[PDB]
Amino acid sequence: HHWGYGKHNGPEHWHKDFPIAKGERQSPVDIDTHTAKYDPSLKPLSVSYDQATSLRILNNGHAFNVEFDDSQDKAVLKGGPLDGTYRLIQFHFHWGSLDGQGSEHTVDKKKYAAELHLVHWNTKYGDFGKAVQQPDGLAVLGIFLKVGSAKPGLQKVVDVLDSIKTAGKSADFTNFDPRGLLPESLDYWTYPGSLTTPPLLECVTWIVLKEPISVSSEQVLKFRKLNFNGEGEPEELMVDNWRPAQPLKNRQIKASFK
Numbered sequence: 001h002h003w004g005y006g007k008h009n010g011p012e013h014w015h016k017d018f019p020i021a022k023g024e025r026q027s028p029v030d031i032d033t034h035t036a037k038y039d040p041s042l043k044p045l046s047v048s049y050d051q052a053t054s055l056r057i058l059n060n061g062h063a064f065n066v067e068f069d070d071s072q073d074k075a076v077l078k079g080g081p082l083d084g085t086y087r088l089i090q091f092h093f094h095w096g097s098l099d100g101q102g103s104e105h106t107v108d109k110k111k112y113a114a115e116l117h118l119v120h121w122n123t124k125y126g127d128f129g130k131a132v133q134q135p136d137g138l139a140v141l142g143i144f145l146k147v148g149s150a151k152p153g154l155q156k157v158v159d160v161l162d163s164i165k166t167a168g169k170s171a172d173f174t175n176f177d178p179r180g181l182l183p184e185s186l187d188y189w190t191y192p193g194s195l196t197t198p199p200l201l202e203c204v205t206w207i208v209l210k211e212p213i214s215v216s217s218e219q220v221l222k223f224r225k226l227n228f229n230g231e232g233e234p235e236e237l238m239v240d241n242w243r244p245a246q247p248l249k250n251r252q253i254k255a256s257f258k
């Protein structure tokens with residue numbers, strides 16, 4: 001694709017091809033913890049990932065996605081601010097060239113080393129492509145990563161990255177359990193927003209968990225060895241694939257906790 005994260009095609013340029021970049025409900029945002037409203041009517045999240053079927057891991061030239069079979073209700077998210085059942089389709093990460101940046105959301109302007117996004121679509125719309133056209137079509141669970149102790153359940157992902165180093169490469173990736181990526185607590189903030197890459201559509205209920213997971217310096221190092229380019233093209237390392245925080249405008253971030 002033409003868009004990317006460089007000097008000449010990065011996020012400050014995206015509005016020329018995708019004018020919704022300057023819309024009213026863009027993501028990510030900074031979560032101001034003292035302005036977020038505790039909402040006692042928000043229900044706990046329900047994460048049902050015991051029957052998840054992972055299929056494939058793909059380098060798509062802007063991140064790597066782990067893709068799941070979403071042809072039945074096997075890995076679903078319900079409850080929280082959601083109405084209805086949302087099926088998991090893929091997860092991916094955003095990360096930095098250094099440990100002090102890489103997350104898309106920030107918490108009181110604090111950046112984390114990386115951010116995991118688990119993407120799910122509302123089954124009332126029948127397929128993902130239809131879901132992205134609706135204001136309640138997607139729910140994305142956002143999880144921050146800080147660098148400290150290794151996360152054992154991430155290691156299977158980092159070990160296959162060698163096989164998808166360049167854009168367009170894919171590998172079989174079966175029997176991966178995404179429960180190994182969740183923090184202990186499911187307390188969260190939620191707001192209405194958008195996809196953070198083109199097409200930047202405003203169809204996302206974001207659910208960002210308060211508790212980060214920790215990963216080791218060696219694990220995040222391995223993300224930084226991937227490439228934005230295709231095989232046999234000049235090497236450009238896949239780092240800093242995050243969009244900066246956007247204006248909150250007329251939105252209220254709600255918290256499930258006090």
Ligand code: NA
Binds near residue numbers: 060065
């Ligand atoms: Na994608």
Ligand SMILES: [Zn+2]
Binds near residue numbers: 117
């Ligand atoms: Zn993302």
